[PDB]
């Protein structure tokens, strides 16, 4: 057994823990973002009829989060 | 240039399967036509050398 | 596995309209490969040991045996799997049995 | 000094000899030949003749000077790991370690704290002893050894203690 | 820069003047080392030491610009030809290439048919 | 159809240690062995499309 | 493999005994080569070079004059290469 | 589909007559991996597609056509120019991606033939040369950055060359 | 939407108690920067005007987002400084940044030239007070006077230039109205009309001649390193060169020809000096000359491909050079000198900051497509259509782009540090956060760089 070369480590490893804790905290809407495609329907290609041009979303294809 | 015997090599490769190294009959055809084609190209060079000797006499 | 890679280039190079000085320079280099390859064997490995240090330990580890032995399959069967399975275009070996074909093998011997 | 200049060239000549020769038995043959060449002039002391040979020693040696000489392992300069393999950590970084992590393995921290307290007390005594040396400028060539036996520590304490470990 | 023989141990004599010359070099070497020795070997410091020689090295390039250059002579004009000069050098290079290009567009087209980018 | 799917597997296998590099799960002394195991199965997944290429 | 303080002294003494120029009975370890052992001015440089070949090769030109005794040379080689903990 | 041409149909049929061996390594691995996880991926994709049920149709593509061209209205006035300048920029942004489709037709030809390369196709080669040459002359590609006011001068420059050359012959 | 909440930062710092201040100034600024990305990105074929001409929409400016990105970052690295002095002095030099942020938003948003001019020179006033105070080394005034008498000497000719255009040809105003502009007939009287519009932007965007404005501002440090990020904002603050060259003088490019040749030599000679220099901050100061010289080349070609590389490099350099200065500040706070040779030691003493040193250095070179590969390479590709000779000169510059970065690395990658005893703690939690907030936004631009280069993209 030896004492070996020493670094700081305590300041270094804590920052990576503090960074990832706030990635994981906003990693929940990333998980919801997958289910938004799964549960809710995205978009279908269809010809528009003369009745309404824009309602809520004017023209948006793919992803419900875009609308 | 070979065309006919060269196409036969691809026929062995089409139904090759595991252990595809065992194909000698198709490989021998590529060594027969190309050797005759190289000899035909060598014959054209030999004909040009023979024509130069006859032209020098006149 | 040398003939299936190195020797195919030398045989193909001789039948060309390309530069003669470039062709002659490559032939000296093919025979030059034998010098530094033997300079690993004869200079260091072969003969009396030079003795680098008093009491030097050299032993085979379990991690070493599993690496070198399985590299031997790749260094021997390379001319069986890669050369045969891959579809080629235009055969080069046809002309000069002693001047072009034999010269690739004779350079390594000489 | 005349004696030092001969020894410095002779040390270089032996290590430069093993670059030309391959085998160790052939190395010993040429080593005896080099001894006979220098012993002929070593017998008598000269002021003009010996100094002429010293400048002559640079010749012949410089004619065969670059066959890529061997420095063997970790050597000052040369080739193959001069400062490599040993990255090391400074002694200043050891005390810089934060709590909680410093609590792990307390045997290394407590022993270092005892040496640090001894170094702090001896620093005042070492400063007076260093200026006590007779020069009255600052220093002459090299650092002076300790005279006192009770106080210990010869001038520098952190010079030998805590350096590097491979 | 290198001469016919590389300088390392060439031309050395003991004499009397050279013996005192090495004594002069060690006198300053030991003087500047001891003031470093007094600053390095104490735990009470904690910080980066100044050193007057290193500060004057940085001051040599960052400052001492306009205190110098007061003797301009012919050396300064030679430096101007190496600076403002090469700017005029490319003026007869880029224009000649452009006049070569501009003539091709109007008569005898050289530009590729499969070109659309910029 | 299998040629397109299996080709991306070799690309993904090499990036999996990089995905687990940023903390994720704790691996003491096993990280040098984890690289060995990742490339070992990457060779087998690359052998099949080359065998498909001969066919 | 790590080097021991007792092992390094025995290794240096073994090389000096087979040198042929120096007597194996006259000098052991404590006796200095400068006064006790019959060694020339040029002989000390050759003996120091052979000792470096067996162990870790490190020999300064300035420190070559300071080292003469086999007991002192064994301690100087161990301290520079970091030995005995 | 519809817009993209490509090849009509690929053959792809195995015979396997020479050598008994272990049938085929390519055929055995294809049948095994189809039911291993490829069948599970098809089942999971069908489970999510059925779970959608209600879906919005949406307009997607917008109309807006002509509204007077730029080479009809003149003189510096914001009321007339703005509608004309928006029309030209609409055409220029679409024509950037028109070429992309024709470029991808040439990309599809290169892979499908391989050994033939330039010996066959010909239809995709002729279609690319006609459009790019027209794109180089009409839609800037030489007359600096995009501007609708400068485009009319670029069209006038090509028209002046047609009037001068035909009059001589 | 953008202005008004930025103005409300001024009463925020003064009303809050002495113990806080820094918590309120940083947190509230971050939520305003989130809302800038929320609304400004939406555009049609041609980007339609925001409202009345006070602050307008963005046509080819995602560079406003960068100003909002540095809006909290210009407070993070300045935390080490200012703390020793009075509480009233702390509040003053946060509000000078708020005033900078107030005027910098106004420059990029407002689609104008007449009122843009009185916001262009208006950024110089808060930076002057910032530079002339808190400077640790001397010659603050030999850099402070040079800060104005380079810029104002070149920019005051815009009063005789811009007003001369609107008196003859309609009015400048909206730029969306600017289609009245007829091509210049090219005469000896029209020479000084073009020069006066250019010389203003020839100073802020440094060349080979009249370039000494920039190194004096960087070497003589204002406050710590966070104010040097605002000096990076001044380089990209002269963005009107994208607008003037395209609209005001479209036919004029014959007089641009000598100015390209000046900037082309401001690539080899500006890089050569950036090798043997002593100061760590100076080796970023001269690399910033050559990196912004690439943009000046791209503008004067006027090709649609070059503006793509021009707009990319404005954002690319704005987050890479500022990243490098934060690393220079992190060594300046520990060693207390800007010398490269003296401050030597990475990995051994600075274990995690050394990886940030690597990522910042390599981004100056052409890495996998982050932003600088979309920046630099696009200009080099566009220069060949101008002339074939360019890449022979431009390729040599690509060798020395490594010689900025690697020479900064190697001269710090030696694990000696014999003279240095300080720098016990490697980096505080805020110091490592600074380094991440510069590279990770560029790493997110790998997926979609549409909001990084957009003049008709």
Curated annotation (Swiss-Prot), chain C:
Q: What is this protein called?
A: NADH-ubiquinone oxidoreductase chain 5
The part of the entire sequence present here spans 387 to 496 of 606
Q: Where would you find this protein in the cell?
A: Mitochondrion inner membrane
Family affiliation: Belongs to the complex I subunit 5 family.
Residues that span the membrane, as ranges: 27-47, 71-91, 96-110
Q: Which organism is it from?
A: Bos taurus
In the UniProt record, the gene name given for this protein reads: MT-ND5
Quaternary context: Core subunit of respiratory chain NADH dehydrogenase (Complex I) which is composed of 45 different subunits.
Name the domain of life this protein comes from.
Answer: Eukaryota
Q: What does this protein do?
A: Core subunit of the mitochondrial membrane respiratory chain NADH dehydrogenase (Complex I) which catalyzes electron transfer from NADH through the respiratory chain, using ubiquinone as an electron acceptor. Essential for the catalytic activity and assembly of complex I.
From Swiss-Prot, chain E:
Q: Where are the transmembrane segments?
A: 75-94
**The organism sits in which domain of life?**
Eukaryota
One GO cellular component, as annotated? mitochondrion
> Does Acetylation show up as a keyword for this record?
yes
Any idea what job this protein has? Accessory subunit of the mitochondrial membrane respiratory chain NADH dehydrogenase (Complex I), that is believed not to be involved in catalysis. Complex I functions in the transfer of electrons from NADH to the respiratory chain. The immediate electron acceptor for the enzyme is believed to be ubiquinone.
Q: How does it assemble?
A: Complex I is composed of 45 different subunits.
Task: Give the family this protein belongs to, as stated in its UniProt record.
Answer: Belongs to the complex I NDUFB4 subunit family.
This chain's protein is named NADH dehydrogenase [ubiquinone] 1 beta subcomplex subunit 4
Source taxonomy lineage? Answer: Eukaryota, Metazoa, Chordata, Craniata, Vertebrata
Gene name tied to this protein? NDUFB4
State start and end of the fragment within the whole protein. Answer: 33 to 129 of 129
From Swiss-Prot, chain G:
Coiled-coil features, chain-numbered ranges: none
Localization, UniProt: Mitochondrion
Q: Name one GO biological process term.
A: mitochondrial electron transport, NADH to ubiquinone
Post-translational modification here is noted as:
Phosphopantetheinylation at Ser-41 is essential for interactions with LYR motif-containing proteins.
Residue positions, PTM O-(pantetheine 4'-phosphoryl)serine: 41
Q: Which GO terms describe its molecular function?
A: acyl binding; acyl carrier activity; fatty acid binding; mitochondrial large ribosomal subunit binding; NADH dehydrogenase (ubiquinone) activity; oxidoreductase activity
Q: Which UniProt keywords apply?
A: Acetylation, Electron transport, Fatty acid biosynthesis, Fatty acid metabolism, Lipid biosynthesis, Lipid metabolism, Mitochondrion, Phosphopantetheine, Phosphoprotein, Respiratory chain, Transit peptide, Transport
Write out the GO cellular component annotations. mitochondrial matrix; mitochondrial membrane; mitochondrion; respiratory chain complex I
| Principal location class | mitochondrion
What this chain does, per the record?
A: Carrier of the growing fatty acid chain in fatty acid biosynthesis. Accessory and non-catalytic subunit of the mitochondrial membrane respiratory chain NADH dehydrogenase (Complex I), which functions in the transfer of electrons from NADH to the respiratory chain. Accessory protein, of the core iron-sulfur cluster (ISC) assembly complex, that regulates, in association with LYRM4, the stability and the cysteine desulfurase activity of NFS1 and participates in the [2Fe-2S] clusters assembly on the scaffolding protein ISCU.
Q: Which family does it belong to?
A: Belongs to the acyl carrier protein (ACP) family.
Task: Say which residues of the entire protein are included here.
Answer: 72 to 156 of 156
UniProtKB/Swiss-Prot annotation, chain H:
Q: Does the keyword Lyase apply?
A: no
Q: Where in the cell is it found?
A: Mitochondrion inner membrane
What are the record keywords, sorted? Electron transport, Membrane, Mitochondrion, Mitochondrion inner membrane, Phosphoprotein, Respiratory chain, Transport
- Which coarse location class describes where this protein primarily resides? mitochondrion
Q: What GO CC terms are in its UniProt record?
A: mitochondrial inner membrane; mitochondrion; respiratory chain complex I
Task: Name the source's superkingdom.
Answer: Eukaryota
Under the subunit heading, UniProt states: Complex I is composed of 45 different subunits. Interacts with CHCHD4.
Family, as annotated: Belongs to the complex I NDUFB10 subunit family.
Instruction: Write out the function statement from the record.
Output: Accessory subunit that is involved in the functional assembly of the mitochondrial respiratory chain complex I. Complex I has an NADH dehydrogenase activity with ubiquinone as an immediate electron acceptor and mediates the transfer of electrons from NADH to the respiratory chain.
Q: What name does UniProt use for this protein?
A: NADH dehydrogenase [ubiquinone] 1 beta subcomplex subunit 10
Range within the parent protein? 77 to 143 of 176
């Amino acid at each position: 057994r030896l004492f070996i070369i020493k670094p700081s480590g305590f300041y270094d490893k804590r920052f990576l823990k503090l960074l990832r804790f706030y990635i994981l905290l906003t990693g929940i809407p990333v998980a919801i973002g997958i289910t938004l495609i799964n549960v809710x329907x995205x978009x279908x290609x269809x010809x528009x009829x003369x009745x309404x041009x824009x309602x809520x979303x004017x023209x948006x294809x793919x992803x419900x989060x875009x609308x | 240039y070979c065309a006919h015997y060269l196409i036969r090599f691809l026929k062995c490769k089409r139904d090759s399967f595991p252990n595809f190294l065992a194909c000698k009959h198709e490989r021998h055809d590529w060594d027969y036509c190309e050797h005759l084609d190289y000899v035909k190209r060598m014959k054209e060079f030999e004909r040009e050398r023979r024509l130069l000797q006859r032209k020098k006499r006149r | 596995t040398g003939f299936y890679s190195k020797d195919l280039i030398i045989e193909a190079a001789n039948t060309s309209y390309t530069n003669a000085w470039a062709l002659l320079m490559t032939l000296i280099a093919t025979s030059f490969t034998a010098i530094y390859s033997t300079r690993i064997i004869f200079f260091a490995l072969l003969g009396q040991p030079r003795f680098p240090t008093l009491v030097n330990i050299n032993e085979n580890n379990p991690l070493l045996i599993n690496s070198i032995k399985r590299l031997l399959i790749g260094s021997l069967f390379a001319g069986y799997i890669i050369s045969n399975n891959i579809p080629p275009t235009t055969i080069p070996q046809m002309t000069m049995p002693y001047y072009l074909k034999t010269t690739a093998l004779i350079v390594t011997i000489l | 000094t005349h004696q030092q200049k001969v020894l410095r060239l002779y040390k270089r000549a032996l290590r430069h000899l093993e670059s030309w020769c391959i085998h160790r038995d052939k190395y010993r043959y040429f080593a005896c030949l080099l001894r006979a060449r220098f012993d002929e002039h070593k017998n008598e002391k000269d002021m003009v003749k010996a100094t002429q040979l010293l400048r002559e020693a640079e010749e012949e040696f410089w004619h065969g000077q670059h066959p890529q000489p061997y420095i063997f392992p970790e050597s000052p300069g040369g080739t193959s790991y001069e400062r490599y393999e040993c990255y090391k950590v400074p002694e200043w970084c050891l005390d810089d370690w934060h709590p909680s992590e410093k609590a792990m393995y307390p045997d290394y921290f407590a022993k270092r704290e005892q040496w640090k307290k001894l170094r702090r007390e001896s620093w005042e005594r070492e400063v007076x002893x260093x200026x006590x040396x007779x020069x009255x400028x600052x220093x002459x060539x090299x650092x002076x050894x300790x005279x006192x036996x009770x106080x210990x520590x010869x001038x520098x304490x952190x010079x030998x203690x805590x350096x590097x470990x491979x | 820069x290198x001469x016919x023989x590389x300088x390392x141990x060439x031309x050395x004599x003991x004499x009397x003047x050279x013996x005192x010359x090495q004594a002069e070099r060690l006198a300053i070497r030991s003087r500047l080392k001891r003031e470093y020795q007094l600053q390095y070997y104490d735990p009470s410091r904690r910080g980066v030491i100044e050193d007057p020689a290193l500060v004057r090295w940085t001051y040599a390039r960052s400052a001492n610009i306009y205190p110098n250059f007061r003797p301009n002579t012919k050396t300064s004009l030679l430096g101007a030809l190496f600076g403002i000069g090469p700017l005029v050098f490319w003026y007869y290079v880029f224009k000649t290439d452009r006049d070569r290009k501009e003539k091709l567009i109007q008569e005898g087209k050289l530009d590729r048919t499969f070109n659309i980018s910029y | 159809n299998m040629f397109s799917s299996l080709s991306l597997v070799t690309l993904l296998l090499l990036t999996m240690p990089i995905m687990m590099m940023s903390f994720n799960t704790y691996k003491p002394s096993n990280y040098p062995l984890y690289v060995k195991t990742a490339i070992s199965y990457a060779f087998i997944t690359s052998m099949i499309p080359t065998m498909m290429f001969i066919h | 493999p790590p080097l021991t303080l007792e092992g390094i002294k025995d290794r240096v003494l073994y090389v000096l005994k087979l040198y042929d120029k120096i007597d194996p009975e006259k000098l052991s370890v404590n006796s200095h080569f400068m006064k006790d052992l019959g060694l020339d001015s040029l002989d000390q440089v050759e003996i120091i070079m052979a000792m470096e070949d067996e162990f870790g090769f490190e020999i300064p030109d300035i420190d070559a004059e300071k080292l003469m005794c086999p007991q002192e040379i064994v301690d100087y080689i161990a301290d520079k290469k970091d030995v005995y903990e | 589909x519809x817009x993209x041409x490509x090849x009509x149909x690929x053959x792809x049929x195995x015979x396997x007559x020479x050598x008994x061996x272990x049938x085929x390594x390519x055929x055995x691995x294809x049948x095994x991996x189809x039911x291993x996880x490829x069948x599970x991926x098809x089942x999971x994709x069908x489970x999510x597609x059925x779970x959608x049920x209600x879906x919005x149709x949406x307009x997607x593509x917008x109309x807006x056509x002509x509204x007077x061209x730029x080479x009809x209205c003149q003189e510096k006035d914001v009321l007339c120019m703005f509608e004309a300048e928006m029309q030209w920029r609409r055409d220029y942004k679409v024509d950037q991606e028109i070429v992309n489709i024709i470029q991808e037709r040439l990309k599809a030809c290169q892979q499908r033939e391989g050994e033939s390369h330039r010996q066959n196709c010909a239809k995709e080669l002729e279609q690319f040369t006609q459009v790019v040459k027209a794109y180089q002359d009409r839609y800037x590609x030489x007359x600096x950055x995009x501007x609708x006011x400068x485009x009319x001068x670029x069209x006038x420059x090509x028209x002046x060359x047609x009037x001068x050359x035909x009059x001589x012959x | 939407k953008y202005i008004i909440p930025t103005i409300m930062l001024m009463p925020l710092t003064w009303l809050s108690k002495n113990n806080m201040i820094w918590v309120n100034s940083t947190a509230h600024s971050l939520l305003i920067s989130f809302t800038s990305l929320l609304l400004m990105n939406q555009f049609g074929d041609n980007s339609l005007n925001f409202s009345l001409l006070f602050f307008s929409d963005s046509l080819s400016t995602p560079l406003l987002i960068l100003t909002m990105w540095l809006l909290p970052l210009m407070l993070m690295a300045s935390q080490h400084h200012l703390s020793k002095e009075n509480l009233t002095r702390k509040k003053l030099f946060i509000t000078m940044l708020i005033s900078l942020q107030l005027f910098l938003i106004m420059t990029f948003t407002a689609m104008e030239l007449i009122l843009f001019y009185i916001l262009f020179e208006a950024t110089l006033v808060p930076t002057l007070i910032i530079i002339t105070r808190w400077g640790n080394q001397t010659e603050r005034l030999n850099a402070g006077l040079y800060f104005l008498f380079y810029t104002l000497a070149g920019s005051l000719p815009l009063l005789v230039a811009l007003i001369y255009i609107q008196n003859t040809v309609g009015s400048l105003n909206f730029l969306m109205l600017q289609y009245w502009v007829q091509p210049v007939h090219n005469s000896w009287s029209n020479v000084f009309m073009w020069l006066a519009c250019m010389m203003a932007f020839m100073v802020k965007m440094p060349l080979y001649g009249l370039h000494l404005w920039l190194p004096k501002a960087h070497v003589e440090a204002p406050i710590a390193g966070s104010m040097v990020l605002a000096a990076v904002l001044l380089k990209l603050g002269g963005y009107g060169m994208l607008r003037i060259t395209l609209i005001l003088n479209p036919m004029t490019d014959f007089m641009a020809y000598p100015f390209i040749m000046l900037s082309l030599w401001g690539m080899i000679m500006t890089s050569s000096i950036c090798l043997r220099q002593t100061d760590l901050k100076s080796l970023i100061a001269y690399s910033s000359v050559s990196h912004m010289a690439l943009v000046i080349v791209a503008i004067l070609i006027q090709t649609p491909w070059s503006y793509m590389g021009a707009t990319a490099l404005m954002i690319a350099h704005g987050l890479t050079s500022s990243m490098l200065f934060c690393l220079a500040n992190s060594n300046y706070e520990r060693i207390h000198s800007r010398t490269m040779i003296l401050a030597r030691g990475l990995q051994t003493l600075l274990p995690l900051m050394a990886t940030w040193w690597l990522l910042a250095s390599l981004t100056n070179l052409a890495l996998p497509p982050t932003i600088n590969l979309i920046g630099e390479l696009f200009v080099v590709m566009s220069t060949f259509s101008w002339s074939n000779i360019t890449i022979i000169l431009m390729g040599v510059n690509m060798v020395i782009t490594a010689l900025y970065s690697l020479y900064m690395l190697i001269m710090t990658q030696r694990g000696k540090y014999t003279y240095h005893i300080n720098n016990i703690s490697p980096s505080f939690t805020r110091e490592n956060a600074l380094m991440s907030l510069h590279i990770l936004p560029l790493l997110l631009l790998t997926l979609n760089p549409k909001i990084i280069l957009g003049p008709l993209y």
